[PDB]
Amino acid sequence: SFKCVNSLKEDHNQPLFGVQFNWHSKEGDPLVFATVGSNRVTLYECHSQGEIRLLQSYVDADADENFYTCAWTYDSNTSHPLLAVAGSRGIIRIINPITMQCIKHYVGHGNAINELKFHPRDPNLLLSVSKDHALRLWNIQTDTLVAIFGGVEGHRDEVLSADYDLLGEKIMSCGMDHSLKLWRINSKRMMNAIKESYDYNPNKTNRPFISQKIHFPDFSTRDIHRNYVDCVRWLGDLILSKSCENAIVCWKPGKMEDDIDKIKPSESNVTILGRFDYSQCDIWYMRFSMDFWQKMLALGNQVGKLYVWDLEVEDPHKAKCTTLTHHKCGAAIRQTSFSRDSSILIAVCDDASIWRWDR
Amino acid sequence: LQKYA
């Protein structure tokens, strides 16, 4: 079981909106996690006796930038880890975590970026979701915009979260329009577009790279939540999503026996497989996380309480809940992250505090 | 509806 072994606070006293362990850290190296808040990203190393060792930050030249999200990948040629960060300026920065140099950056979104996710099988495919109502898929090997997911049948308000399924064949997105939308990226069109993005070298051609405009989701529902949907994750063929209504809903498109890959864009039904209720999480932009194996789920609420659900049970509604509290942890927890071996859980807070829980 | 507590 988890025990609180340490805490600290960052000097900017602004909300920490994101935290991510590097699950690509090398064998024998210490566990490392990144935090994002204010205009900075900071790396820490976990050591014995609860020590949280401060390494080095990247601080944006723009004092008005506010980083919201980060995501780890690695360089596909060298294996060295890379860190992507983004927030209110709508600029994606690719950071070398060793030196905290910004290697390159991407602009395109019309507004703030609310989440970044890397493809589960391709370290170069980066998904961003934005306040401008669109998702964008980037190839950070050839520095190309592969596709924009939008249109009037796309989201009609800010996109707040998205997630790739296990094989990276499809994306589920969600946001302020209360909707969850499915976008298949294993279509012939999208597989071809990804292949072409790898063949693009601007020094060897005259053409710009053409991005796909994907204006129709492969499924859409507004029947799960009744407010902003701010976090979504695949659990196999099922979906876990939450709003600001003190519940994570486990659901699937279609009827109970409907295969996810036979769902048509006109599908009108959903099936609710369970709901995990909790308390005092009425504000939006509050993210849950899962461990590497998807055996557990952790969510913090707006008064500093952690909920952890054990999903190693026969059916989703049988999940087993544990709660973790500390008398000094009273600020809203924006995001959690498990280490890859699941031995450490980190929570970060609106008062710039960081909380370490060891199993 | 608020982003902050």
Residue numbers in the entry:
A (entry chain A): 81 to 439
B (entry chain B): 1217 to 1221
Task: Reproduce the article's own wording on this structure.
The polycomb repressive complex 2 (PRC2) is a histone methyltransferase complex that is required for the maintenance of cell identity in all multicellular organisms. Here we provide functional and structural evidence that the vertebrate-specific PRC2 accessory subunit PALI1 emerged through a convergent evolution to mimic JARID2 at the molecular level. Mechanistically, PRC2 methylates PALI1 K1241, which then binds to the PRC2-regulatory subunit EED to allosterically activate PRC2. High-resolution crystal structures revealed that PALI1 mimics the regulatory interactions formed between JARID2 and EED.
